[PDB]
């Protein structure tokens, strides 16, 4: 943290922070808190853990008058596959947005298993748009997410009455879900694709549906993007 701090306020350069296995650092912090021989709190964790994380995640931000900014994206293992975990509950109200992992998508032999429902970012408003990322970013993101969600609802509905009862939006969401899951979701091990490749693959994959099949799209966007 001090290392990232030196490259921002002093050296003035763009920095990115990444923490791995925060759960082990939490158990370590538990042994360290028990080093004061204090009676532990709920589920064997210090009551000052809120402040312990508050002196950690507060190391990220942009400084006024300084060109160099430091950004942090920590990683933590949720206990026993539970979101009720003290770690998740502590980073939940503190950090902005959360990127989870779907055990279903990891055990199905597919790529990166971030559940589309759970995936969110609070700074997503400032990181997209014309001049930031792309004008096709937010609207198509919401459209693809809605396609995956409605696609899941249709996945359950088709698992009920069958595929003979598939409706227009239902079948459209079925193809959209199958595609988004086996393609959009698929990225790579070392593979890094550009934002332009993301917007293009998004418009192209969402092109499977008609122009009026997406109520999540704006007219100006649809006229200046789809081609």
């Amino acid at each position: 943290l001090t290392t990232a701090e030196y490259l921002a306020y002093q050296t003035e350069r763009h920095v990115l922070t990444i923490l791995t296995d925060m759960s082990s650092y939490a158990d370590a912090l538990r042994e360290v808190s028990a080093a004061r021989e204090e009676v532990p709190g709920r589920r064997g964790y210090p009551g000052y853990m809120y402040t312990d994380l508050s002196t950690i995640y507060e190391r990220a931000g942009r400084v006024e008058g300084r060109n160099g900014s430091i950004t942090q994206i920590p990683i933590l293992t949720m206990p026993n596959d539970d979101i009720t975990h003290p770690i998740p509950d502590l980073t939940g109200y503190i950090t902005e947005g959360q990127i989870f992992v779907d055990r279903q998508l990891h055990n199905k032999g597919i790529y990166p298993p971030i559940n589309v429902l759970p995936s969110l970012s609070r700074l997503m408003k400032s990181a997209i748009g014309e001049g930031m990322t792309r004008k096709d970013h937010g609207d198509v993101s919401n459209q693809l997410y809605a396609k995956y969600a409605i696609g899941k609802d249709a996945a359950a509905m088709k698992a009920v009455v069958g595929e003979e009862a598939l409706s227009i939006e239902d079948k459209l969401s079925l193809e959209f879900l199958e595609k988004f899951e086996k393609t959009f979701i698929t990225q790579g091990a070392y593979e890094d694709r550009t934002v332009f490749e993301s917007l293009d693959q998004a418009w192209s994959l969402l092109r499977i549906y008609p122009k009026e099949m997406l109520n999540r799209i704006s007219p100006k966007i649809l006229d200046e993007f789809y081609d």
């Binding site: 709190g41 709920r42 210090p46 009551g47 000052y48 809120y50 402040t51 109200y93």
Partner: peptide, 23 residues
């Protein structure tokens, strides 16, 4: 205000006062 309440909970842990309910 939930931040002042949780900070009051950590202050409760710092003062040695026994907690009541839900921390």
């Amino acid at each position: 205000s939930s931040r002042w309440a949780e900070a009051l909970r950590e202050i409760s842990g710092r003062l040695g006062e026994m907690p009541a309910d839900q921390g």
